Design a protein around this ligand. Structure first.
Ligand code: HER
Ligand code: HER
Lengths: 306, 304
């Protein structure tokens, strides 16, 4: 038994990571078919950080100003263009390791794996959630910009995130693979409020179901509640409101454990109002919100990939 | 910045995972050069589980009793032998995806990544520590037997663990890649005690340094302690005793942060005696012991 915050196997994404240099800036790019994707701030200099005019900066660049290196191989750049906040470099060779892939824009509270890379070289992989305020609590040292987040379905990689920046608060912000930021953020070095973060309620509930499946039961209380009553408590404790859609995706776990969703909500309500009293759940003293209901079902089912 | 429990990128190991079937038992194997490694209990039947005589059971098997599938393609087994608790199936094809590799036996408290596989296919990857009692806290679904644990040094994979069994407590036990179990365990379906686990003190200290590097400094004090005095407290809270070797390996973190090792020990001593009183460290309400000093340095310096 047990429960780990597992990441997706990263091999299919490892084969897509390249290094992109423009001027004196070097970061990570994603090479799929004959296109390399990377953050457009690769064209900034240290003098351009506070408010770059990306259109004017890019007009100064030609194809030969972009150095793209895949391992030891130098790729020939035959076109460049900007799509929102992502630079797209057309190269003259398709990546022979291109997996089946999609570009997806995920919802706040959904999870994905990040392949943290530095200067084109994979460093580590970890699983995380897109916070309700559209930030990531990652591990991104300088040189990790352009690292990507993804999910896998059997043999198809769904890319959902590209890392662009660390905010002054220490949290991380990025885009989908069409270059549109998650959240209100812009790619310039300024103070930017992320606004109130909240706890992903449906994920906490899923993790409580995981705990029951692993043999925990001390927090199962004698109460039930209603959706409206629970959401009164959720808002008081900066938890995301629960919808019937959330209740529906919790259905499989409720069926397996025999614990009606609103009963588990009542037990979560008691934990929020009474605290943990020094007790742990799945070894944790805080409530965990980086497992989606699907994540729990996958691990409990031993779902595998190519 | 930020600090995550990162696993190694799994691609080099993914290319080595195969499916091994003997009779009606199917589990994971590791294909390196022209050898496939898997737990020898693949040759057990349901009536063999309580006390298998593996030498007798293997004698009844020939090469054609082993079905190895790599992707959609059957590999021809041309030889078989038992090394301690691992079965080595010689195949007629060298794995073309064999990475540079070594087999290593790790120490209790060291960390590695596990590629959790079922029936030859990966489910996910996670970072873990070998507990001081030589067990592993793994993923949920039983039957990932033959999945491996590893570290990567640039392009070279150091395999250190093969999963063999879940103990009745649910924790995982396994071998090195020469088939020697970590801990006292045997590959039989019997009640087996793992004995007292302890917290990996040198790892907690490393993680406290990681917290200071990331801006959490509230637990620092200017109290002095000695190794002997610290260990008096650590033993009371079921922490592993700290040795001079442990102090020595924390040196690089002391050197980059400006916090002496014994100063961090005095900070941990106060944390154990006083508790955290509702405060968190790196977002955690409990002290984390699954980062080695080397792990912290790697992550904080961006090794790839
Ligand atoms: C990552 C970065 C990198 O670049 C930026 C650019 C910004 O505005 C143009 C803002 C911002 O917050 C930011 C970062 O946080 C950040 O990490 C820069 C360089 O040179 C490299 O190599 C990265 O990997
Ligand atoms: C994993 C196992 C598997 O096998 C064993 C065998 C044991 O003694 C012979 C003991 C033991 O505790 C044990 C396990 O916990 C365990 O998971 C069996 C099968 O069939 C498959 O497919 C595995 O992956």
């Amino acid at each position: 038994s047990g429960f780990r915050k597992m990441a997706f196997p990263s091999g299919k994404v490892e084969g897509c990571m390249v290094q992109v240099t423009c001027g004196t800036t070097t970061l990570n790019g994603l090479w799929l078919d004959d296109v390399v994707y990377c953050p457009r701030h690769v064209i900034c200099t240290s003098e351009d950080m506070l408010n770059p005019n990306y259109e004017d900066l890019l007009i100064r660049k030609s194809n030969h100003n972009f150095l793209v290196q895949a391992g030891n191989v130098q790729l020939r750049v035959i076109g460049h263009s900007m799509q929102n906040c992502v630079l797209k470099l057309k190269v003259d060779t398709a990546n022979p390791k291109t997996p089946k892939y999609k570009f997806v824009r995920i919802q706040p509270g959904q999870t994905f794996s990040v392949l943290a890379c530095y200067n084109g070289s994979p460093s580590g992989v970890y699983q995380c959630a897109m916070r309700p305020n559209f930030t990531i609590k990652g591990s991104f040292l300088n040189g990790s910009c352009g690292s990507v987040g993804f999910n896998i379905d059997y043999d198809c990689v769904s890319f959902c995130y590209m890392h662009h920046m660390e905010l002054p608060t220490g949290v991380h912000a990025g885009t989908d693979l069409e270059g549109n930021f998650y959240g209100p953020f812009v790619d310039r070095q300024t103070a930017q409020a992320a606004g109130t973060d909240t706890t992903i309620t449906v994920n906490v509930l899923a993790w409580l179901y995981a705990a029951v499946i692993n043999g925990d039961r001390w927090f199962l209380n004698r109460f039930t509640t209603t959706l409206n009553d629970f959401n009164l408590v959720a808002m008081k404790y900066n938890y995301e409101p629960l919808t019937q859609d959330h209740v529906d995706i919790l259905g499989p776990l409720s069926a397996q454990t025999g614990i009606a969703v609103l009963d588990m909500c009542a037990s979560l309500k008691e934990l929020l109002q009474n605290g943990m009293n020094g007790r742990t759940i799945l070894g944790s003293a805080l409530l965990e919100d980086e497992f989606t209901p699907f994540d729990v079902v996958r691990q409990c089912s031993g779902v595998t990939f190519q």
